[PDB]
Design a protein around this ligand. Structure first.
Ligand SMILES: N[C@@H](CCC(=O)N[C@@H](CSN=O)C(=O)NCC(=O)[O-])C(=O)[O-]
Length: 221
């Protein structure tokens, strides 16, 4: 057999949620880091990127691009996408809300400076008034340890990943949400996730100015 190969640059960006999901599932993977525009052009010219973009993951004979296509395949393959169509609908609704908030946070480094204060404030307001109340309500509704089906799913993984990013922005935002705090602790203690959180794993740090400059050179923006 062959390990999945993750093509991206050496940063969180749009590949980090896949790193989290594979690690949580206990699946070993390799990474091939793009370090220059030439490296990206070589993937393009070799025919490996359907829309000439990364993330790309080589898995099970496919060269899959598009974050959501990659994640959906991995979640189904490793039994992290619920047990039927209705559970998948709940999972999809939850994770698309997570993705909407995650996208706002992802794009902060490219926000025009004159708009950044207001953008950050609006994100914090949405966390406190829209997203954290919605997920706290799910957990309170059923009283169970996981978001869907009383069993670990991708929704728990994606949410807990997001909770780490929210903590980096403002550690007080989760303070009024005890069920979210408890979920963060439980998921972080699962053996595979605990290992991924320790040093030396593929988990990536927050993007710094040097990494942003590298992204500008690689992706030509
Ligand atoms: N919807 C796609 C977006 C992929 C994408 O935008 N990739 C960028 C780098 S990731 N940070 O956004 C990319 O390859 N840019 C090069 C280009 O579009 O020419 C996805 O995979 O999620």
């Amino acid at each position: 057999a062959e390990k999945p190969k993750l093509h991206y640059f050496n940063a969180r960006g749009r590949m980090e949620s896949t790193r989290w999901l594979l690690a949580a599932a206990g699946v070993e993977f390799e990474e091939k880091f793009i370090k220059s525009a030439e490296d990206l052009d070589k993937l393009r010219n070799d025919g490996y990127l359907m829309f000439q973009q990364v993330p790309m993951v080589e898995i099970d004979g496919m060269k899959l691009v598009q974050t959501r296509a990659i994640l959906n395949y991995i979640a189904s393959k490793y039994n992290l996408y619920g047990k039927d169509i209705k559970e998948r609908a709940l999972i999809d609704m939850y994770i698309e809300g997570i993705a909407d908030l995650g996208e706002m946070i992802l794009l902060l480094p490219v926000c025009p400076p004159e708009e950044k204060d207001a953008k950050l404030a609006l994100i914090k307001e949405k966390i406190k008034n829209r997203y954290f109340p919605a997920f706290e309500k799910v957990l309170k509704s059923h009283g169970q340890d996981y978001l869907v089906g009383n069993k670990l799913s991708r929704a728990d993984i994606h949410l807990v990943e997001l909770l780490y990013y929210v903590e980096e922005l403002d550690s007080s935002l989760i303070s009024s949400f005890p069920l979210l705090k408890a979920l963060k602790t439980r998921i972080s203690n699962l053996p595979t996730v605990k290992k991924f959180l320790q040093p030396g794993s593929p988990r990536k740090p927050p993007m710094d100015e040097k990494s942003l400059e590298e992204a500008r050179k690689i992706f030509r923006f």
